[PDB]
RNA sequence: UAGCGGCGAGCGAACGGGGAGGAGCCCAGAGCCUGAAUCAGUGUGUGUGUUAGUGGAAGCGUCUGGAAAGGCGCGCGAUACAGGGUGACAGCCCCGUACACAAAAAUGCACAUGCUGUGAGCUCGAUGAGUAGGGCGGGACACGUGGUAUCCUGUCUGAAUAUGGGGGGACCAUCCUCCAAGGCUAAAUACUCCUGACUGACCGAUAGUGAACCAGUACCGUGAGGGAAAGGCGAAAAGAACCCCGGCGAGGGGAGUGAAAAAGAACCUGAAACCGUGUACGUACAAGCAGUGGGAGCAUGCUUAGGCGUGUGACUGCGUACCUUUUGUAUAAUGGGUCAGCGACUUAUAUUCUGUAGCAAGGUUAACCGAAUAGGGGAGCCGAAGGGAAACCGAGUCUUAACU
């Protein structure tokens, strides 16, 4: 069960979803993988091939009292080479469905212990305005939050862009890193019901 | 847990062998590949199954057999995955929808893998002498 | 890219249930009249690959 | 991520050049030469911790042999005379007594004379 | 994988399946009837989009400082806390930003539709000859002439032509399947000299383009062609009026600006090599990798009324540099004039093994639909069964006539 702060209604949520042992390694791996997915990795140096110049030997092999050289472009020279030049690469890494679900089940269950998960009934601002949302969180005693909702209101969305420490994401689009990052998590009764069914 | 507080399980990560980095690294100067020779060099080493010019094992032995085309289009149905189709009818097209065997497999055979419960009438399918005892002992009549 | 099997090896070896490889014996193609029957009989069945040269087979054909 | 390494190297050279402070010529000024001298200084330092113990023993033994022969006994018979009288006093002290308190030392030789 | 292959090195399919995207028609021509589907223009309709743009919210007081955006304390706008500038770090000083509005004129689009101009329904009969195939020689097919189907042809030949011909991998015969010897067809696909916007676990002047700078310049070459080096005063030039020395010089010293001028243009920071000036000790009877353990004196500090630290190092025991390559190097074997910067086990996909996490006789998705790191999609793959060359049999099976 999960009590509310303006009703005290017994929302009987599943045991294994919101009440399991916090597996650290899984969560760590999934959040690290999620971070690694965020990278675009758009970078490139140029190999001795790719550098502009000639392939001609600056001086002949023998005869001259100098270190044998083949090109201007060689990485031991100045102004051309970079031995192992990088290529635009994809750092995103695979995560198993059961591991991603297991990690969400692991982190979302730990918020019930730490009391960061503030489950609520209907949560929605009157008109599309930040001023009201900023004021109404002072009564709720919140600052840095992830307001999860089932029915995503444009009124509520538009009202929480400009606020830095608030973020409004849909119950469908919850993430591993976000649930960990934010200092509290305000879930709607519908959103809990959706996420329960989604994670299963 | 916060974003900093997390950590991996002890044993997960293992750094990586960084060659050519001083004496203290152990490996460093000739990074774990000895002094001179073909193997030490960049792009070094020989190709697969090369025994220094001696006639390799994969050539000094005679080649045998031929690959059967009929063996490609036959399956070995394990009797454990028998009652997973449509009650108790397992011809071929029915079995194929259950994803037990591949699409291009006309011939097929049921072997004694163990465990049957429901009565399954195994029609239009070759069946083994041990499986014929089991399948009937469960209840279902073959053919 | 994927590893290419050393085809010549793929036709001379077959992977048994445990992991070892069966192979046909040499010295049973030609020049057989001078050979005694006891050799030719012993060379006829297939035989297992030795421990020493197992790594040379395993590398040549990584798939099966 | 490119790692420019001008900061760390200089610190490593500077650390060693500080250890070479006092030496003649490029051995103090020039890392490539200093680093050899600082290592060899370590090799000699490691060695001479063993030799310090040897040299001082010889140095004491010379003083004891000098102070004993004044009283009429050679070092060989003196130490045997002390060992036969079961005296546990070492060379370090015997040499120190031999220099400082000779009126004291005399009695040790007279004790060695008995045995 | 099946194959191909001095059956070596290597090369490497299709069938079938899951997806993206889907669309078809004209000719080798004769009736009635004919502008009606169709497009290809001159166009007409809004909607635009675009190349100029407009508005666009709400802060004050003290403290430190050269300077406030800073601290400190109280406000207020937020569909605007993207970002930039401003004398240090600005939601509210400025330019922007979100949001609502814009085009006289040229244009790129998607639908009405007047139209020089183009052909609908339906009869009866046509169905691409030096061609298909063949011999010879080459080539393309994963397929190297091999038992080699298939296609293309240089060369020499030669059918039937729909009661016909092609194909089904030598070939034949039955079945099935298509209809060559003429054409036109969007989308999914590849690319970015170029124009915008936006983003980086990209670089920050030996890096990043060769080129942050009047660089494809200087310079080199007959020429094709090669090809550099070189960034930063300060918030603001307030870039030093004026004296003094000097050659109505270079260069300095004062004065003056400024928070600061060892920030004064050879201009932030200013290392090291290298070259000096002055202070302390040692140093002109003393042999050698120049150090190292011992150690007198002398010179400097501290607190005490006695001991330490630091610099120096007379004299003295031991002591032949580093790297490389080697059986072995003080070696008179290699390499290094020194310093600073840069300079070498990497990246991608496959594979086996170790560790670790998930789930477990199961595990698991790939491309793709996705506003998208969810969730679909199990097409597949791998495992749970192997023996046999193979048919085939299967907790057995191979061998063999058969197995104690
Ligand atoms: Mg050339
Ligand atoms: Mg040379
Ligand atoms: Mg030279
Ligand atoms: Mg380089
Ligand atoms: Mg350059
Ligand atoms: Mg470069
Ligand atoms: Mg990787
Ligand atoms: Mg925070
Ligand atoms: Mg915004
Ligand atoms: Mg569950
Ligand atoms: Mg599910
Ligand atoms: Mg640890
Ligand atoms: Mg790596
Ligand atoms: Mg070692
Ligand atoms: Mg090794
Ligand atoms: Mg070497
Ligand atoms: Mg050797
Ligand atoms: Mg070697
Ligand atoms: Mg090479
Ligand atoms: Mg190689
Ligand atoms: Mg399947
Ligand atoms: Mg034998
Ligand atoms: Mg046999
Ligand atoms: Mg072994
Ligand atoms: Mg197999
Ligand atoms: Mg297999
Ligand atoms: Mg950097
Ligand atoms: Mg000294
Ligand atoms: Mg010292
Ligand atoms: Mg020098
Ligand atoms: Mg110095
Ligand atoms: Mg030694
Ligand atoms: Mg000793
Ligand atoms: Mg051969
Ligand atoms: Mg075929
Ligand atoms: Mg075919
Ligand atoms: Mg197909
Ligand atoms: Mg369409
Ligand atoms: Mg269409
Ligand atoms: Mg307009
Ligand atoms: Mg404004
Ligand atoms: Mg102020
Ligand atoms: Mg402060
Ligand atoms: Mg405050
Ligand atoms: Mg923006
Ligand atoms: Mg900003
Ligand atoms: Mg700003
Ligand atoms: Mg910028
Ligand atoms: Mg400042
Ligand atoms: Mg700030
Ligand atoms: Mg601030
Ligand atoms: Mg403020
Ligand atoms: Mg107009
Ligand atoms: Mg208009
Ligand atoms: Mg007008
Ligand atoms: Mg025009
Ligand atoms: Mg035709
Ligand atoms: Mg043909
Ligand atoms: Mg013919
Ligand atoms: Mg033919
Ligand atoms: Mg002929
Ligand atoms: Mg031909
Ligand atoms: Mg072609
Ligand atoms: Mg060829
Ligand atoms: Mg052949
Ligand atoms: Mg032809
Ligand atoms: Mg014919
Ligand atoms: Mg004719
Ligand atoms: Mg027809
Ligand atoms: Mg007809
Ligand atoms: Mg007929
Ligand atoms: Mg044919
Ligand atoms: Mg056939
Ligand atoms: Mg046709
Ligand atoms: Mg035709
Ligand atoms: Mg046609
Ligand atoms: Mg043709
Ligand atoms: Mg088109
Ligand atoms: Mg289309
Ligand atoms: Mg714009
Ligand atoms: Mg970044
Ligand atoms: Mg930087
Ligand atoms: Mg440059
Ligand atoms: Mg610089
Ligand atoms: Mg460019
Ligand atoms: Mg120019
Ligand atoms: Mg000239
Ligand atoms: Mg010229
Ligand atoms: Mg002046
Ligand atoms: Mg004057
Ligand atoms: Mg004058
Ligand atoms: Mg003059
Ligand atoms: Mg001047
Ligand atoms: Mg002047
Ligand atoms: Mg002045
Ligand atoms: Mg004056
Ligand atoms: Mg004055
Ligand atoms: Mg002043
Ligand atoms: Mg002042
Ligand atoms: Mg100053
Ligand atoms: Mg200052
Ligand atoms: Mg001044
Ligand atoms: Mg001044
Ligand atoms: Mg000063
Ligand atoms: Mg001054
Ligand atoms: Mg500055
Ligand atoms: Mg300066
Ligand atoms: Mg300086
Ligand atoms: Mg200096
Ligand atoms: Mg002096
Ligand atoms: Mg003096
Ligand atoms: Mg003197
Ligand atoms: Mg003399
Ligand atoms: Mg002297
Ligand atoms: Mg001399
Ligand atoms: Mg000597
Ligand atoms: Mg010396
Ligand atoms: Mg010393
Ligand atoms: Mg000492
Ligand atoms: Mg001393
Ligand atoms: Mg000393
Ligand atoms: Mg003194
Ligand atoms: Mg004093
Ligand atoms: Mg000496
Ligand atoms: Mg010596
Ligand atoms: Mg060498
Ligand atoms: Mg050796
Ligand atoms: Mg040698
Ligand atoms: Mg030696
Ligand atoms: Mg030498
Ligand atoms: Mg040599
Ligand atoms: Mg060397
Ligand atoms: Mg060098
Ligand atoms: Mg040299
Ligand atoms: Mg490696
Ligand atoms: Mg576990
Ligand atoms: Mg478990
Ligand atoms: Mg299951
Ligand atoms: Mg799909
Ligand atoms: Mg697969
Ligand atoms: Mg499979
Ligand atoms: Mg099998
Ligand atoms: Mg019989
Ligand atoms: Mg029998």
From Swiss-Prot, chain A:
It holds the Pfam family Ribosomal_L4. Part of the 50S ribosomal subunit. In TnaC-stalled ribosomes forms part of the binding pocket for L-Trp with the leader peptide and uL22. One of its GO terms (cellular component) is cytosol. InterPro entries: Ribosomal_uL4 (IPR002136), Ribosomal_uL4-like (IPR013005), Ribosomal_uL4_dom_sf (IPR023574). PANTHER family: 50S RIBOSOMAL PROTEIN L4, LARGE RIBOSOMAL SUBUNIT PROTEIN UL4M. SUPFAM superfamilies: Ribosomal protein L4 (SSF52166). This is Large ribosomal subunit protein uL4. Transmembrane segments: none annotated. Residues 43-70 are annotated as: Disordered. GO terms for biological process: cytoplasmic translation; DNA-templated transcription termination; negative regulation of cytoplasmic translation; negative regulation of DNA-templated transcription; negative regulation of translation; response to antibiotic; ribosome assembly; transcriptional attenuation.
Swiss-Prot record, chain B:
Pfam families: Ribosomal_L27A. SUPFAM superfamilies: Ribosomal proteins L15p and L18e. Residues 21-31 have a biased composition (Gly residues). One of its GO terms (cellular component) is cytosolic large ribosomal subunit. The keyword Nucleus does not apply. InterPro entries: Ribosomal_uL15 (IPR030878), Ribosomal_uL15/eL18 (IPR021131), Ribosomal_uL15/eL18_sf (IPR036227), Ribosomal_uL15_bac-type (IPR005749), Ribosomal_uL15_CS (IPR001196). It comes from the Bacteria. Keywords: Ribonucleoprotein, Ribosomal protein, RNA-binding, rRNA-binding. The keyword Ribosomal protein applies. GO terms for molecular function: rRNA binding; structural constituent of ribosome. One of its GO terms (biological process) is cytoplasmic translation. Residues 1-54 are annotated as: Disordered. Signal peptide: none annotated. Part of the 50S ribosomal subunit. Contacts the 5S rRNA. Belongs to the universal ribosomal protein uL15 family. This protein binds the 5S rRNA. It is required for the late stages of subunit assembly, and is essential for 5S rRNA assembly onto the ribosome. This is Large ribosomal subunit protein uL15. It comes from Escherichia coli (strain K12).
From Swiss-Prot, chain C:
Belongs to the bacterial ribosomal protein bL35 family. One of its GO terms (biological process) is cytoplasmic translation. The keyword Magnesium does not apply. Keywords: Ribonucleoprotein, Ribosomal protein. Residues 1-21 are annotated as: Disordered. GO terms for cellular component: cytoplasm; cytosolic large ribosomal subunit. Part of the 50S ribosomal subunit. Residues 9-21 have a biased composition (Basic residues). It comes from Escherichia coli (strain K12). GO terms for molecular function: structural constituent of ribosome. NCBIfam families: rpmI_bact. This is Large ribosomal subunit protein bL35. The gene is rpmI. HAMAP family: Ribosomal_bL35. The keyword Transcription does not apply.
UniProtKB/Swiss-Prot annotation, chain D:
Keywords: Ribonucleoprotein, Ribosomal protein, RNA-binding, rRNA-binding. The keyword RNA-binding applies. SUPFAM superfamilies: Ribosomal protein L20. It comes from the Bacteria. It holds the Pfam family Ribosomal_L20. InterPro entries: Ribosomal_bL20, RIBOSOMAL_L20_CS, Ribosomal_protein_bL20_C. One of its GO terms (molecular function) is mRNA regulatory element binding translation repressor activity. One of its GO terms (biological process) is cytoplasmic translation. GO terms for cellular component: cytoplasm; cytosol; cytosolic large ribosomal subunit. HAMAP family: Ribosomal_bL20. Belongs to the bacterial ribosomal protein bL20 family. Part of the 50S ribosomal subunit. Contacts L21. One of the primary rRNA binding proteins, it binds close to the 5'-end of the 23S rRNA. It is important during the early stages of 50S assembly. NCBIfam families: rplT_bact. This is Large ribosomal subunit protein bL20. It comes from Escherichia coli (strain K12). The lineage of its organism: Bacteria, Pseudomonadati, Pseudomonadota, Gammaproteobacteria, Enterobacterales. The gene is rplT.
